[PDB]
């Protein structure tokens, strides 16, 4: 199958007869499910994203059915808005990014060109928007706030910025602010014709 | 783990 990035790549998953909506997230090393009871031992862990860290419980060897595929591996449980299917399980069910083909065994980091500069950024199907670490871009910008861990984070919003990604030109909105990693979100992934596929 | 989600 093929899954478009026009919208959030949400899929219903099932864990032990519990059915939950989850986001297919190439920007996530791990799978993070909203608070639920799971059987077995777990250990506390801290995971990072935009906004900071949240404390989760790490359960190993949890079966998760995803679009008719059986994944089994580590599931982190904690206070998240959206169930996130990360690369640990995506790789197991054979998910790839395509536009050529990019596998998910490693972080899907690519070189982009923006403002004459080369930067490394993460292809992130779990992000609506493209967010870069602090830099100077030419043009007007608007103050914007985006939702993070612990609350809203302040960013600068630049519109109609040319970005070259994997030999493809995009022109679109780039947010600049305190992200742990440069992320290419669905706004630009769609422009370069990226889809998720098994 | 780095878990990058953004809305």
UniProtKB/TrEMBL annotation, chain B:
List localization entries.
Host cell membrane; Host endosome, Host multivesicular body; Virion membrane; Virion
- The organism's superkingdom is given as Viruses
Q: Which family does it belong to?
A: Belongs to the primate lentivirus group gag polyprotein family.
What is the protein named?
A: Gag polyprotein
What is the source species?
Human immunodeficiency virus type 1 (HIV-1)
Q: What is the lineage of its organism?
A: Viruses, Riboviria, Pararnavirae, Artverviricota, Revtraviricetes
Q: What part of the full protein is here?
A: 374 to 380 of 500
